[PDB]
Amino acid sequence: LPAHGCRHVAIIMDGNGRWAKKQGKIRAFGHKAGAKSVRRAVSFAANNGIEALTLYAFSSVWALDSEVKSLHRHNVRLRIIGDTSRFNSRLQERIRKSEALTAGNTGLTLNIAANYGGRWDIVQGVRQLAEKVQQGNLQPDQIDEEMLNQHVCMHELAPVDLVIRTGGEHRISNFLLWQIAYAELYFTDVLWPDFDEQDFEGALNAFANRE
Amino acid sequence: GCRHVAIIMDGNGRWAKKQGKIRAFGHKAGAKSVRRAVSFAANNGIEALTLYAFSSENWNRPAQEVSALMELFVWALDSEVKSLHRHNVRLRIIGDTSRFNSRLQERIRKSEALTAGNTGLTLNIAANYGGRWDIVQGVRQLAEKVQQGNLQPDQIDEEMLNQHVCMHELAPVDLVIRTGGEHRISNFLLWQIAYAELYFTDVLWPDFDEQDFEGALNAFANR
């Protein structure tokens, strides 16, 4: 266990539009600078002994194929969480191949939320339980919190210890809900493209000091 | 327009210790702070106030001990019901009261029925409540409907689950305040907080007053 105590960090990456606007640039430049900040955060987490990093791009992707070889070379295990059923069967395959490629990697596990909502996630788990009920396999009175826990996204990874939201808003915006029942919540006014290794270190040391 | 505010009322024990007093003194001051916050919300046109009976000192206690403390908390509210009712407040207890003693369960049901027709502030007191428990109680209901053959698994959506979790008749929660300095939800509302403003203050619950409540309402109006 590392000294900061944090096994799984989730981040609501907000502020790319506002970063671009401050500069008199269009939103697209913010999104490019935001991508650079993702690579930097991924590297920092891989180098500071974090088990899992889960990222939500908050709007206030086809990059996958462009970054996946780099992730694989950093020993990152990639996973997409979210409702990917309505992506075309072709995008679903390129997502599946990126997951398959990095599934044996032993470093950071990187979860990227894509068409994700915390309410959706709970409902999908409830549907898996209801199917087991309707098959006659599961009794309703056997359903408890631990059972539903074992049906939500990321249930097999360490619980989320710390949620960081950049960009100044103080809301979860239907990112993780069930999973953040006991997480430390850390809100910073730093905009996502500016959020660097020292800012990440600050959030981890804040978690260590407050835990 | 903050229509529904929820508050994690932490800090009563820490407050008593700073005052050089035993835990009970902090419970009593916490309860005074409840009366003041309910009054403030009713005077400021808030539609619904949801209060979570909570102490971080309880993290390291068995479920049965915690439930016992929650029965005491709810008993203490029994003497306040007549005045709430006169003030047109609708009182509801949310949470797992199934193993409360039967006389207290009957009093809870009586106080809820007495005030259920009231059209002023709705005051929810979350006793022996957890956000995961709340969701699972709603999931168990849907699972019974499936087993009975009255519901298809693929019919279950967010709207449907929403209708089976606490408070689905009231305005969405706009604002969650947590006093006492910790920055966590601690398994209060989960489903219902998806889009709420979260406001954390280091003020301990017994000290949280009308100016503090207005500060939180300002955070929300700005954001």
Author numbering:
A (entry chain B): 13 to 72, 90 to 240
B (entry chain A): 17 to 239
Excerpt from the publication:
Undecaprenyl pyrophosphate synthase is a cis-prenyl transferase and is responsible for the condensation of eight molecules of IPP with farnesyl diphosphate to form the C55 species, undecaprenyl diphosphate. Following the condensation, undecaprenyl diphosphate is converted to Lipid I, Lipid II, and lastly, to bacterial cell wall peptidoglycans. Comparison of these crystal structures reveals that UPPS is a highly flexible protein system, showing very mobile binding pockets in the active site region.
Crystal structures of the ligand-bound and apo form of UPPS reveal that a major pocket closure occurs upon ligand removal, from 1032 to 432 Å3 and is in good agreement with the time-averaged pocket volume (332 Å3) of the apo form obtained from the MD simulation. We also described the first complete apo E. coli UPPS structure with an intact active site. Furthermore, it appears that the active site of the apo structure opens and expands considerably upon binding of bisphosphonate ligands, shifting the population of UPPS enzymes to a markedly different conformation. The most dynamic region of UPPS is the loop comprising residues 72–82.
